[PDB]
């Protein structure tokens, strides 16, 4: 129909330290299966 509130795009809220909390866990375990800050997270190429 229309807008009667405020122009505010949709957004998601994650905590700032949680993503580092899970990071150190997978990182430490990743050192076993894969060669051991050499870990790089990059966006997908696309398509």
């Amino acid at each position: 129909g229309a807008i009667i509130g405020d122009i505010r795009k949709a957004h998601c809220n994650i905590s700032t330290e949680q993503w580092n909390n899970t990071l150190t866990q997978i990182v430490d375990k990743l050192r076993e299966q894969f060669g051991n800050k050499t870990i790089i997270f990059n966006q997908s190429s696309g398509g």
Partner: antibody
């Protein structure tokens, strides 16, 4: 105690590059923002806008044709100049300071805030009229 | 746009359009033959030099209209009142609204 003095010839010929001046009182122009207000005789005031050195030289969007604001740091003077005065320019003008104000209603990074200005003090002004 | 209120009574002033979005209303007054001044510098915040008698509506209203409530009108209240809306929807409006000239008997 804040007071200021203006100038003007009183009678201005049509189609003349009229110039107006406004001085300061104690406060320097570098650390302050100035605004001009035009009020027709007996009607609601009209806001020209605000001018400030180093980038903040926004003018009135409605006119954006002949308005020209300049500053003189050495003389501590601000000048207002119009080119091609018309018959509808007969109004009282006011040069005065303004104060900022912030409001946020959304995400800090998505530009949901607009600065609003309020004039704590107002100038004495000088009458300008056009005749033949 | 002329309002007649007897001394010592309550007064209501209506200014601005419908509340499509949030507002930050600024209230101004004009004295005949004297420079203007300020009363309220925000939606509800006020500067020094004036008591808490003045009141206003918050800017979190949708579909309503900005209003001003004045009580215990005195002899010094005779002045022209102007409103300045500040909406996030429309650009900054450089023309003030219909000034309400409040006269006291």
């Amino acid at each position: 105690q804040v007071h200021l003095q203006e100038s003007g010839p009183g009678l201005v010929k049509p189609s003349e590059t009229l110039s107006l001046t406004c001085n300061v009182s104690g406060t320097l122009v570098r650390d302050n923002y100035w605004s001009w207000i035009r009020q027709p005789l007996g009607k609601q005031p009209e806001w020209i806008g605000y001018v400030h050195d180093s980038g903040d030289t926004n003018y009135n969007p409605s006119l954006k044709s002949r308005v020209h604001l300049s500053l003189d740091k050495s003389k501590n003077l601000v000048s207002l100049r119009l080119t091609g005065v018309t018959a509808a320019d007969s109004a009282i003008y006011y040069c005065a300071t303004t104060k900022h104000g912030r409001r946020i209603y959304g995400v800090v990074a998505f530009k949901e805030w607009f600065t609003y200005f309020y004039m704590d003090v107002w100038g004495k002004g000088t009458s300008v009229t056009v005749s033949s | 746009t002329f309002v007649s209120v007897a001394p010592g009574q309550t007064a209501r002033i209506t200014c601005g359009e419908e509340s499509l979005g949030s507002r930050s209303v600024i209230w101004y007054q004009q004295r005949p033959g004297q420079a203007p001044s300020l009363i309220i510098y925000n939606n509800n915040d006020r500067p020094s030099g004036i008591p808490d008698r003045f009141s206003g509506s918050p800017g979190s209203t949708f579909g309503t209209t900005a209003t001003l409530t004045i009580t215990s009108v005195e002899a010094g209240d005779e002045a022209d009142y102007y409103c300045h809306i500040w909406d996030s929807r429309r650009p900054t409006n450089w023309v003030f609204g219909e000034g309400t000239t409040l006269i006291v008997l």
